[PDB]
Amino acid sequence: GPAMEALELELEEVESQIRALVVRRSRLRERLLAVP
Amino acid sequence: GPAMEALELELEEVESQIRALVVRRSRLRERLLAV
């Protein structure tokens, strides 16, 4: 129903935002290893 | 040096954001599994 659909959408959003932050974290860690 | 210090700060910021989003993910999953 509507309530489940709303929650499922919110879950998809949060998962996508986490994936993006994790890519950023990996990139920043790579950089950290590239400076003095 | 300063470049490492800057990257370490950004890494702290990103981690805090991830941790908060992971808690939300858990809460939402819980609700759906409570159906």
Numbering used by the authors:
A (entry chain A): 12 to 47
B (entry chain B): 12 to 46
Structure paper excerpt:
Instead of Gag, non-LTR retrotransposons frequently encode a distinct multidomain protein named ORF1p, which is translated from the first open reading frame (ORF1). To learn whether the esterase domain is more than a mere molecular fossil and to learn about the potential functions of esterase-encoding ORF1ps in non-LTR retrotransposition, we took a structure-based approach and characterized the ORF1p of the ZfL2-1 non-LTR retrotransposon from zebrafish, Danio rerio. We defined the boundaries of two functional domains and determined their crystal structures. We also demonstrate that the esterase is enzymatically active and binds to negatively charged liposomes. Together, these findings define a third class of ORF1p architecture and suggest that lipids may play a role in non-LTR retrotransposition.
The first structure is that of an N-terminal coiled coil domain that we show to cause a dimerization of the molecule, an assembly mode that is clearly distinct from the trimers formed by the LINE-1 ORF1p. In analytical SEC, the N-terminal construct indeed shows self-interaction and we find it to exclusively form dimers, whereas the esterase domain remains monomeric at concentrations up to 75 µM. A proteolytically stable fragment of the N-terminal construct gave crystals that contained two copies of an antiparallel homodimeric coiled coil per asymmetric unit, and the structure was refined to an Rfree of 21.5% at 1.55 Å resolution. Each α-helix comprises five heptad repeats, confining the coiled coil to the region between M15 and P47 as we would predict from the sequence. Because of the charge compensation between the highly acidic N-terminal heptads and the highly basic C-terminal heptads, we presume a preference for the antiparallel orientation also in the absence of crystal packing constraints, an arrangement that is clearly distinct from the parallel trimeric coiled coil formed by the LINE-1 ORF1p. Whereas coiled coil domains and their ability to multimerize are hence frequently present among ORF1ps, the resulting assemblies can differ significantly in terms of structure and likely do not always have a common evolutionary origin.
